[PDB]
Amino acid sequence: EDKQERANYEKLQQKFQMLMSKHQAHVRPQFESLEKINKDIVGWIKLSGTSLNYPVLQGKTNHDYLNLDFEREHRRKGSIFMDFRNELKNLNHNTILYGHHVGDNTMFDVLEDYLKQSFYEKHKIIEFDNKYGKYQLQVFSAYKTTTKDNYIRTDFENDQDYQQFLDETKRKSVINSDVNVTVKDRIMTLSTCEDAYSETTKRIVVVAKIIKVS
């Protein structure tokens, strides 16, 4: 069955790109189309030359699309989804997306490649789009973590705090980046997610500077 599963994302990827060519500069029409399939589709995330090229969901909670594809049907690999706490249009300091990593080379399997400096060099930019504009993700950190509390923070009490976070985030990186991030920039965190109650406790985190290129 994994056949049709791949086919579904294949149809949808081909559809997105045609819309991205049909409506081009305009992202509003592109996503009003995607939302016909499912209103929870709030964005699209793509990394050229890799399997990362999917729609981003957001439900009421962070287990809503843990085991559900984009048309709301049960799947072990579920789908890529944003933290239920993040706002669109007016991004929080830190926006977070999650996705499975099973080794099938799908969803967030590519986050592991970011641990290697070589790979990072050849894939410094990641594309992210939604109804409010086109964005560019400038990867500036990648690492493994056993925790699951601090790196999932949405906003901060003050610049100092956010400042510390950025510093910490930079120090944890296993890759070197030329990207210069400041407490004035907004960031996006791509996090790996295990199955419900899998509790394998071992995640791959990739962090990037968000840039509106529209």
Side-chain angles (χ1 to χ4, degrees):
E1 180 200 62
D2 176 65
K3 307 294 180 180
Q4 60 179 60
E5 179 187 60
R6 285 179 164 184
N8 284 66
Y9 280 119
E10 205 172 70
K11 296 174 73 292
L12 199 71
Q13 290 166 344
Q14 290 182 50
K15 183 183 181 56
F16 175 68
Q17 292 177 297
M18 98 71 179
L19 300 160
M20 190 171 108
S21 180
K22 172 182 178 181
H23 303 311
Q24 194 199 310
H26 307 61
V27 272
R28 195 75 174 186
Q30 292 181 61
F31 288 75
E32 295 181 309
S33 169
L34 284 185
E35 291 161 8
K36 291 175 187 164
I37 308 172
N38 183 343
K39 78 174 194 305
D40 299 311
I41 292 170
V42 302
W44 194 282
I45 187 159
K46 182 179 181 183
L47 170 63
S48 65
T50 71
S51 45
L52 186 283
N53 174 18
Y54 309 95
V56 186
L57 293 285
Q58 185 186 57
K60 307 186 187 66
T61 81
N62 284 325
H63 63 275
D64 226 74
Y65 282 81
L66 228 195
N67 292 95
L68 291 178
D69 77 317
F70 67 84
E71 53 207 347
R72 293 191 61 78
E73 293 188 58
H74 294 73
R75 301 285 178 180
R76 179 207 175 195
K77 271 140 55 184
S79 60
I80 292 95
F81 65 87
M82 187 180 288
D83 193 296
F84 76 86
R85 298 169 295 159
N86 288 315
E87 299 290 62
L88 301 174
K89 198 181 189 66
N90 294 309
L91 276 15
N92 301 304
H93 279 296
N94 183 44
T95 300
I96 305 72
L97 306 195
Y98 306 94
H100 279 97
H101 169 49
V102 311
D104 191 306
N105 181 204
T106 61
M107 313 320 282
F108 274 172
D109 279 306
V110 301
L111 293 191
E112 183 170 8
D113 294 337
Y114 270 111
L115 301 176
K116 306 164 300 187
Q117 178 78 14
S118 294
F119 181 85
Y120 163 72
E121 297 267 293
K122 301 178 58 171
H123 310 280
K124 313 179 80 180
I125 306 307
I126 293 177
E127 308 170 303
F128 179 71
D129 306 304
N130 53 54
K131 262 195 302 67
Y132 306 105
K134 287 198 74 296
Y135 294 88
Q136 197 196 196
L137 296 190
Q138 304 222 104
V139 177
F140 72 93
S141 178
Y143 61 90
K144 279 182 185 285
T145 187
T146 57
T147 68
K148 44 206 63 183
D149 176 63
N150 186 65
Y151 85 75
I152 64 175
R153 292 222 278 147
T154 286
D155 275 294
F156 306 77
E157 277 56 296
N158 55 49
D159 283 0
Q160 179 49 52
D161 197 305
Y162 186 49
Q163 175 71 293
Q164 289 187 180
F165 200 72
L166 300 177
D167 302 309
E168 189 57 44
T169 283
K170 291 181 184 183
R171 189 196 63 57
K172 288 190 289 186
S173 184
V174 302
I175 53 168
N176 306 303
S177 180
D178 184 64
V179 176
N180 56 301
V181 190
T182 66
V183 306
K184 300 295 182 181
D185 311 349
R186 283 195 240 68
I187 63 171
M188 184 168 281
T189 297
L190 305 190
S191 185
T192 204
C193 205
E194 62 286 357
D195 289 302
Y197 299 88
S198 178
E199 199 180 68
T200 302
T201 303
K202 171 56 66 171
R203 297 170 187 180
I204 302 169
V205 181
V206 177
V207 193
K209 182 172 77 175
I210 305 180
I211 293 299
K212 180 172 178 176
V213 295
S214 62

